[PDB]
């Protein structure tokens, strides 16, 4: 019932040239010191920009050599990778880095053995993963761990049955998943957990009809999807929910045309980029998730995207990591 109202003049065509221009120029538009406040997620920022450019066939417009040097400088002695130079290592940025290196077929830029040791070190006795040495437990980090290792061909380095047990202990009455055991279902953690279960070949343990229902009920009359009951829809939740539905074989349970119209309405016709919601300020994060959502909805101008890894399928085919989905 809380929803956005899309205006009659909202963009209704895909503006791919503008989006590529936007991402290619991102981080050159303001003064250096201005950008600054998001240095703590820079590695993931880099991943978002590179991945959306590759989905659009424009990866070459980014700076490969500069990025590879950057990634190398962000790997710490423990094997983990930080968001930026001088920041601390974390599974989130370790994943982002390995995703980037996979895009560029440059995995040996970093010490792979030490990445594997880092990830292995963060698993707890109950099978869960901490994000770093400070011990925050979240199913987001279970996904980061197995996705990183799958991309490196080293899933066997962790205790997989215990990891699965932990994730399944986070399954709820409504078929979804939260942060930790007892946590409420949330689209972000559903995405991480269904991705995790795809990677570990455990999708048969999901109640796809029940979870599918919870997920398709995220669609609002505007066409956009929210991340849980009583939230406003946005492009981020829309990707998480749509990708989860794809993983469990129920993408047809939402109105694809209405979602497509919502996502297109989030484009900025003047600057390019997508925002979280129609009319708001664009950013690379929502640009990736908008383009990725449109691809899963069947947009021919965009490369097919993995709902598990949010990377081009053609990249994952190259490294032979393509988890079976429900259908």
């Amino acid at each position: 019932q809380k929803d956005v109202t899309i205006k009659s003049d909202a963009p209704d065509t895909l503006l791919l040239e503008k989006h590529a221009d936007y991402i290619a120029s991102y981080g050159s538009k303001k003064d250096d010191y201005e950008y600054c406040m998001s240095e703590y997620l820079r590695m993931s920022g880099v991943y978002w920009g590179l991945t959306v450019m590759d989905l659009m066939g424009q990866l070459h417009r980014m700076n490969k050599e500069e990025i590879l040097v950057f990634i190398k400088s962000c790997q710490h002695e423990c094997g983990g990778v930080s968001a930026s130079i001088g920041h601390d290592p974390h599974l989130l940025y370790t994943l982002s880095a390995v995703q980037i290196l996979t895009l560029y077929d440059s995995i040996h830029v970093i010490n792979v053995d030490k990445v594997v040791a880092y990830v292995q070190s963060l698993q707890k006795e109950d099978g869960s993963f901490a994000g770093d040495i400070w011990g925050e437990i979240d199913t987001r980090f279970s996904f980061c761990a197995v996705a990183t290792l799958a991309l490196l061909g080293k899933l066997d380095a962790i205790n997989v049955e215990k990891a699965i047990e932990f994730v399944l202990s986070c399954m709820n009455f409504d078929g979804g998943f939260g942060c930790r055991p007892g946590s409420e279902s949330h689209a972000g953690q559903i995405y991480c957990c269904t991705g995790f279960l795809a990677i570990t070949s455990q999708l048969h343990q999901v109640n796809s009809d029940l979870l599918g229902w919870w997920l398709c009920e995220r669609q609002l009359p505007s066409g956009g999807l929210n991340g849980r009951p009583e939230k406003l829809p946005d492009v981020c939740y829309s990707w998480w929910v749509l990708a989860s539905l794809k993983i469990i074989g129920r993408l047809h349970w939402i109105d694809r045309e209405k979602l497509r119209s919502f996502i297109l309405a989030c484009q900025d016709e003047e600057t390019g980029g997508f925002a979280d919601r129609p009319g708001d300020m664009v950013d690379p994060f929502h640009t990736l998730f908008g383009i990725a959502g449109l691809s899963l909805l069947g947009e021919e101008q965009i490369k097919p995207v993995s709902p598990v890894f949010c990377m081009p399928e053609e990249v994952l085919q190259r490294v032979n990591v393509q988890p079976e989905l429900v259908s």
Partner: protein, 313 residues
């Protein structure tokens, strides 16, 4: 006129944050684990609580100072840190980093006052009953303090009846009830009381989805149709008639239509086949975005019916 001052002040803030950040990284590289780091990071984390490396810096400092300060000095630092955290949470109550730092701090105290932390949760849930970070922290505190599930159950009831925005509170109940009745699938007396509670809720606020989702769970958590007691049979039939009355009051309400179908399934799928198909038609017209879901559900139910008819002696 009014926009340049806003542009300029925000440029000055960025320059201060960059300078303070530079200072922290330099002190850290020099091995200066002291109170000046706590002062500098406080200037940055209020506005930017997702700057995770700075929370790590605070923890390194607090760990170092604990070794060299008196127990009384260390206690003073902890209390200051609790106050800093609460001031941060008031500005941004949805930061993973802030809540994690509070957990980290409390978990290492001799010492801790858990009842006060439970009250901090009650306060933040009064402000936003859907704040999952606060509910997660509440679950942490309750485990640490060994709060009984029955106590937490009384809390959820008060939150469900005093106002709406109930999904988080119904969710918590779904976790607590199986604990009060733990099996290695609720007992019927418990189930019947829950059905009464949830039915009050969706007749009070028929538009809110939380009670309808919880009710669907309850409808699967019991005996099975071939096993219905006369009391449960009668209760479910009463619910069916009450939903039809709601359908008359709110002809655009899709939740009550779906629930009518689910109740007929729980009672007697073959006997209610005709009405079930009629309700699917009405429901698809009222909720067309869900038409493909509803067609798959109907297909599933019709396959179940075929299997039931083939069991016929």
């Amino acid at each position: 006129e009014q926009a340049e001052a806003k542009r300029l002040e925000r440029e000055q803030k960025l320059k201060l944050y960059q300078s303070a950040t530079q200072a922290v990284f330099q002190k850290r590289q020099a091995g200066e684990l002291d109170e000046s780091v706590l002062e500098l990071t406080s200037q940055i984390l209020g506005a930017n609580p997702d700057f995770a490396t700075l929370w790590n810096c605070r923890r390194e400092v607090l760990q170092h100072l604990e070794t060299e300060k008196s127990p009384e000095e260390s206690a003073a630092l902890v209390k200051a840190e609790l106050g800093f955290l609460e001031s941060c949470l008031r500005v941004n109550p949805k930061s993973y980093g802030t809540w994690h730092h509070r957990c980290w701090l409390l978990s290492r105290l001799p010492e801790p006052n858990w009842a006060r932390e439970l009250e901090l949760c009650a306060r933040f849930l009064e402000a936003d009953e859907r704040n999952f970070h606060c509910w997660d922290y509440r679950r942490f505190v309750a485990a640490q303090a060994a709060v009984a599930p029955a106590e937490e159950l009384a809390f959820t009831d008060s939150l469900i009846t005093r106002n709406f925005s109930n999904y988080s509170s119904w969710h918590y109940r779904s976790c607590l009830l199986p604990q009060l009745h733990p099996q290695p699938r609720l007992p019927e007396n418990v189930l019947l009381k829950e059905l009464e509670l949830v039915q009050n809720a969706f007749f009070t606020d028929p538009n809110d989805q939380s009670a309808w989702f919880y009710h669907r769970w309850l409808l699967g958590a019991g005996s099975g149709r071939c096993e219905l007691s006369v009391e449960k049979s009668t209760v479910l039939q009463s619910e069916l008639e009450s939903c039809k009355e709601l359908q008359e009051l709110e002809p655009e309400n899709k939740w009550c239509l779906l629930t009518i179908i689910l109740l007929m399934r729980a009672l007697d799928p073959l006997l209610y086949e005709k009405e079930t198909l009629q309700y699917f038609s009405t429901l698809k017209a009222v909720d067309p975005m869900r038409a493909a879901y509803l067609d798959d559900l109907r297909s599933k139910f019709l396959l179940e019916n075929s299997v039931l008819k083939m069991e016929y002696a």
